[PDB]
Design a protein around this ligand. Structure first.
Ligand SMILES: O=C1O[C@H](CO)[C@H](O)[C@H](O)[C@H]1O
Ligand SMILES: [Mg+2]
Ligand SMILES: [Mg+2]
Ligand SMILES: [Mg+2]
Ligand SMILES: [Mg+2]
Ligand code: NA
Ligand code: NA
Ligand code: NA
Ligand code: NA
Ligand code: NA
Ligand code: NA
Lengths: 1015, 211, 174
């Protein structure tokens, strides 16, 4: 029958014999155990060692497997994705479906996972009651057999499928047989931009319930105007035989303290002409001065639901955590407990580099801690309901959650082809309705989402309305079809820019500031996706945050995204390396486009994370004279775990410091008067740095945690004193090939054929492996490349424009190279032209002045043709002969920073090991730049000026020629790139030019100056 | 939905049509037991959607109806919204759950009286004149059923029409109903007679209430 | 398979292999006839005499009926309600369901009407295009076979159920 019906090629069949969805159950038979959330003996985990065999199609499955274990089968760990055990390849594709687009059909070659378990069932479980099996996650469809007899079928990879096994199980040993299909008609609704995997990848469990049971319960909290009074409303549904002696008690607990309790017999109020629900009861509990739940303070109560007899015998108990909070939109603002939210959000996929899409508590907690530590307060479940434990953790740790249906149909043409089709309404409905049924009691869930990138169809409008009717407590959002359709309560665009319109036909992305005020528009705006964090990215992040703070109805957004979707592979020597699309022989694939995270796959941060942390700070600072004004952005909490530390330094040299307690009410201000500052007689810039420090450890942070910082320039004293008068004068020698300059043990050589400084000597040691030359290019960032699909090349992309203009192949032509002797120095004057096909792209004019103190002053003046694309950088590069242990600089740091991503960076004296000056982006590019630098030290060398730099063992050439970081080899000596000017990195999205105009190198004429000396 | 020729005849002769989904769950306790259940949303959806797909080009159809006597469930709200999104050209009405729910553009009660209130719990039938002016109410009122014409009946029919003419927002109603549901049986002589509930050995039955 | 799946006791299955709904079609191959709403040669009525047999339950239907006319069958006019031909009793109930309220299940004794028709098709229809069958009203659910091969399943007694017969039709009598 199973093979004949082909239920996996029919969207009209999404299940057979599947039980109703419901909130998490455990069927406790002891009230205290329900209260304390202790493990229940009635809830049996079947996780661990299962038997598994791979087949190319369900037709290839032998009949004998239904009754008997296959000898060719292996023993594997469950939950798992079978791609992670090497049975077939994980496929990375973004938009294009991994299967031929021919709904509702899937390939005849359909990887089939045959799972089995032999297991014992106790006597007591079958004597009475109902034994069900629960599969929390099976990708993408499966049939189920128990002891050789067919039980049921399930679809939707991201929600639990449950089946009653009572009549199938026997005392003693039993065998389950699960045939998992990689492809089904469900796959048409699962086109998320992620690895395409399959298998039993979430928990498997048995649950025993009495025949007379709690089948559903809903918890609601409503409030008065000032939240000083609440009513907890608990609707309880039963299954089994209704009897007059049956009662429900709902009790509410704050720790060990019962705060409220109510008991009633079954029988709801009259709802229509036929009466009411005889099998339901609603308990209402008064709560005075409830402790309110927020991300700031995640106050929780425990609700216990007891099904019992009048005389007091417990039948069973269910329970949940309760957070007293109200979510509403009013006058265009999203309010939490009456106060307007500012969403510091991030999108987060369920991804592990070893285990694929199998989640575990340790990874979940690691993520939550890192999120909160970097000033995030919200997460979007992109793009499916998560592992059930995720919501529990967000309840307890305190994060706002957008719970999103497992519906994405991105690869359809047009995008709404399935979602506007009433034939697909049933399958879509189940993915929405069963999520709401499961997750509705979690306080952390504050908004429901209808899915992602499925256009806008009438099915969306139908399901939007279903949620509004069933759950008035939460707004509903959905971005498809232009982000402001009738199926959304919140304007929720993806990658809409701050100031720049992107007027695409039908689905424009307006400037967020403009979008709010379009004629007739009143809704709040929270971007479902923004600041695409792919590789060297997050340029322009501060622009979003400035706008969020200025505009009441701009209530934030969710960064895309949390973690790179890279997977571990091993080389010939068993060494692990980070892989992306195409690395598993998967084709077609979209290469590195799965790696868009603020953190690496192992949760090591990319440099962009610190920019996010800084911009998302909860304290804002102003300086006027000697007064620091601290403003709190918290809505609920006082600053009762915060101290402000301040420091004044003169060019990195500490002059004064101090600490002041912070006592700031939510949304309040505090003024801190700085004490009298000493007046430094020395020349240089005074800088003030302030930091907010949390002295006490929390559930989410260590003692001493820095949560906020800011810097200001104070007084500057410009140097007017003459440098010590030299009497030594450098000596010039002119040959046909070279200008040679000598002073003591130092020699400088300028090649007269090339017009570059080709060598320097200190004693007998040469200092250069390659000459000091101008550089106007960078190894392209993912943002420069500007591709979201491997097939699609955009001629507008920065890399394509640079390549087409000849930037990467431009040849230096010598125009001038002269030498002169001054009264105390030798002056070398040079001019070069970079040309391509007869077009002069850049002209560099330089002077090198070498004085009696051994300092080489380099003055650079660059012309850039107004009709050539604006260059990636304007600077010099060379390969130094030296490798040295440390890099020491006075400038912005300590982490990697770029012109449009440097607000997090602080001006100070920084000293790091060389390897920290390289950022190991999995796809290599220009990296490790530090801006606003006045002095750089490396071995015997010092450079002074006002420049940006990077320093590493990898040349720009090698970086642009290498696709994977593990394939990089350290070159001889050290590559130094010192820039007068560097182009922004952009990142508003990574598939179109995204560097804002003010960060493009468009001035035409540029001036910079450097001093090179020996320290 | 009717035999397809009905709509053609209504187009050509000229009659306004309320086209109604084949959904009635009257015998459920409570009435909305299936219609508030998401498991029943797919079955219900097809009864609504496939009607609209079939009949949307008929000018005689001026109003869609979500069915009859199925309480008010969340499935009703979902399908109301589906129709509004797909076909803006016609109002959507539905009487279930008290005749004035979020699933209806028209206050559309059955057997609400002209002056006399019937304050049933949860689903009151207010006087039609009173109903219009309930705090916040703005909708038109057209009875989906009124003046029950069972046997010697239609007493007080003139009361409705006087009210309909006097009150702008009272825009009429549909009499229940057109034709006796009697069936022909034959006696010992072969002579025809009109039969009702119970006459075919059918039991339980509701006797003459079909006429 | 048909008896095993019990599609008539599952609200998750309201049809199998049924074509999309649509406004009234006639597939005119002449524009003027379309304008004047004249009979279309591509729209054929199968109304008239069919063969019919009544059974107390679907389990009682012999496998032989799928390919062979039952000797006990009668000739009846279609369209019709089989109560009006006297095969079983029509039931008048107002509110109370005529069956035990136990969703999604129905009584084991479930009156079953077995309709059949043998017919030929224009040769040109066997050569190109798509021939579908249209059941404007079947109360309350039905399975359909063509030339002994299962075609599909439909529910909702008041809207047309349509199925593609293209791959089932043969020369001569079907
Ligand atoms: O538009 C999007 O941007 C991301 C690009 O990495 C990713 O594809 C998300 O799933 C999608 O919603
Ligand atoms: Mg299917
Ligand atoms: Mg997508
Ligand atoms: Mg700053
Ligand atoms: Mg069915
Ligand atoms: Na704002
Ligand atoms: Na991506
Ligand atoms: Na404090
Ligand atoms: Na590269
Ligand atoms: Na009127
Ligand atoms: Na009647």
């Amino acid at each position: 029958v199973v093979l004949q019906r082909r239920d996996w090629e029919n969207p009209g069949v999404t299940q057979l014999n599947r039980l109703a969805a419901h909130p998490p159950f455990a069927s406790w038979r002891n009230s205290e155990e329900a209260r304390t959330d202790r493990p229940s003996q009635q809830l049996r985990s079947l996780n661990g060692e299962w038997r598994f065999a791979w087949f190319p199609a369900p037709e290839a499955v032998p009949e004998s497997w239904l009754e008997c274990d296959l000898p060719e089968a292996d023993t594997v760990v469950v939950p798992s994705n079978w791609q992670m055990h090497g049975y077939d390849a994980p496929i990375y594709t973004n938009v294009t479906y991994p299967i031929t687009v021919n709904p509702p059909f899937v390939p005849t070659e359909n990887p089939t996972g045959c799972y089995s378990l032999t297991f014992n069932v106790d006597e007591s479980w079958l004597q009475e009651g109902q034994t069900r099996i629960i599969f929390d996650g099976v990708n993408s469809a499966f049939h189920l057999w128990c002891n050789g007899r067919w039980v049921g079928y399930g679809q939707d990879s991201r929600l639990p499928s449950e089946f009653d096994l009572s009549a199938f199980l026997r005392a003693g040993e039993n065998r389950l047989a699960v045939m998992v299909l990689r492809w089904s008609d469900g796959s048409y609704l699962e086109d998320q931009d992620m690895w395409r995997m399959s298998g039993i990848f979430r928990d498997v469990s048995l649950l025993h319930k009495p025949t007379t049971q709690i089948s559903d319960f809903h918890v609601a909290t409503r409030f008065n105007d000032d939240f000083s009074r609440a009513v907890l409303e608990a609707e309880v549904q039963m299954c089994g035989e209704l009897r007059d002696y049956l009662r429900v008690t709902v009790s509410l607990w704050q720790g060990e303290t019962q705060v409220a309790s109510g008991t009633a017999p079954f029988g709801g109020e009259i709802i229509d002409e036929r009466g009411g629900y005889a099998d339901r009861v609603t308990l209402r509990l008064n709560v005075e001065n409830p402790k309110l739940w927020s991300a700031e303070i995640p106050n929780l109560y425990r609700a216990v639901v007891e099904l019992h007899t009048a005389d007091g015998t417990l039948i069973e108990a269910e329970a949940c955590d309760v957070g007293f909070r109200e979510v509403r939109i009013e006058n265009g603002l999203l309010l939490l407990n009456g106060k307007p939210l500012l969403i510091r959000g991030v999108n987060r996929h369920e991804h592990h580099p070893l285990h694929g899409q199998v989640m575990d508590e340790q990874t979940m907690v690691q993520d939550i801690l890192l999120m909160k530590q970097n000033n995030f307060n919200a997460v979007r479940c992109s793009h499916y309901p998560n592992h059930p434990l995720w919501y529990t953790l967000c309840d307890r740790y305190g994060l706002y959650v957008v719970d999103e249906a497992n519906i994405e149909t991105h690869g359809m043409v047009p995008m709404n082809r399935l979602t506007d089709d009433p034939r697909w309404l049933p399958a879509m409905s189940e993915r929405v309705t069963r999520m709401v049924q499961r997750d509705r009691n979690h306080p952390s869930v504050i908004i429901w989402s209808l899915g992602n990138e499925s256009g806008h169809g009438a099915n969306h409008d139908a399901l939007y309305r279903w949620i509004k009717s069933v759950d008035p407590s939460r707004p509903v959002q959905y971005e498809g079809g232009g982000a402001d359709t009738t199926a959304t309560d919140i304007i929720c665009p993806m990658y809409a820019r701050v100031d720049e319109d992107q007027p695409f036909p039908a689905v424009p992305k307006w400037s967020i500031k403009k979008w709010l005020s379009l004629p007739g528009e009143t809704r709040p705006l929270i971007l479902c996706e923004y600041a695409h964090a792919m590789g060297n990215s997050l340029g322009g992040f501060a622009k979003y945050w400035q706008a969020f703070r200025q505009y009441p109805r701009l209530q934030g957004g969710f960064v895309w995204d949390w973690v790179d979707q890279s997977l571990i592979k091993y080389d010939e020597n068993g060494n692990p390396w980070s892989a992306y699309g195409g690395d598993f022989g998967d084709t077609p694939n979209d290469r590195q486009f799965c790696m868009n995270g603020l953190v690496f796959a192992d949760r090591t941060p990319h440099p962009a994370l610190t920019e996010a942390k800084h911009q998302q700070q909860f304290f804002q600072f102003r300086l006027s004279g000697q007064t620091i004004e601290v403003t709190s952005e918290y809505l609920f909490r006082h600053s009762d775990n915060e101290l402000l530390h301040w420091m004044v330094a003169l060019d990195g040299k500490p002059l004064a410091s101090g600490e002041v307690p912070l006592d700031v009410a939510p949304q309040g201000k505090q003024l801190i008067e700085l004490p009298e500052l000493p007046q430094p007689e020395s020349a240089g810039q005074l800088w003030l740095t302030v930091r907010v420090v949390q002295p006490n450890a929390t559930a989410w942070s260590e003692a001493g945690h820095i949560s906020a910082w800011q810097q200001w320039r104070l007084a500057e004293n410009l140097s007017v004193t003459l440098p010590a008068a030299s009497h030594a004068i450098p000596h010039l020698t002119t040959s046909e090939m070279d200008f040679c300059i000598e002073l003591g043990n130092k020699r400088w050589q300028f090649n007269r054929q090339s017009g570059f400084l080709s060598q320097m000597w200190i004693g007998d040691k040469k200092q250069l492996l390659t000459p000091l030359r101008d550089q106007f290019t960078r190894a392209p960032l993912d943002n420069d490349i500007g591709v979201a699909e491997a097939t699609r090349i955009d001629p507008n992309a920065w890399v394509e424009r640079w390549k087409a203009a000849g930037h990467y192949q431009a040849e230096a032509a010598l125009l001038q190279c002269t030498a002169d002797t001054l009264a105390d120095a030798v002056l070398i004057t040079t001019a070069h032209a970079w040309q391509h096909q007869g077009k002069t792209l850049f002209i560099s004019r330089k002077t090198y002045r070498i004085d009696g103190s051994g300092q080489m002053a380099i003055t650079v003046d660059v012309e850039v043709a107004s009709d050539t694309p604006h260059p990636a950088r304007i600077g010099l590069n060379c390969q130094l002969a030296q490798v040295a242990e440390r890099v020491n600089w006075l400038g912005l740091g300590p982490q990697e920073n770029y012109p449009d991503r440097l607000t997090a960076a602080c001006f100070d004296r920084w000293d790091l090991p060389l390897s920290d000056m390289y950022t190991p982006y999995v796809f290599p590019s220009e990296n490790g730049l530090r801006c606003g630098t006045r002095e750089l030290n490396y071995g015997p060398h010092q450079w002074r000026g006002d420049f940006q730099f990077n320093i590493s063992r990898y040349s720009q050439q090698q970086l642009m020629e290498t696709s994977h970081r593990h394939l990089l080899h350290a070159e001889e000596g050290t590559w130094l790139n010192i820039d007068g000017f560097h182009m922004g990195i952009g990142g508003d999205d990574s598939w179109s030019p995204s560097v804002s105009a003010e960060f493009q190198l468009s001035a035409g004429r540029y001036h910079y100056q450097l001093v090179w000396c020996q320290k």
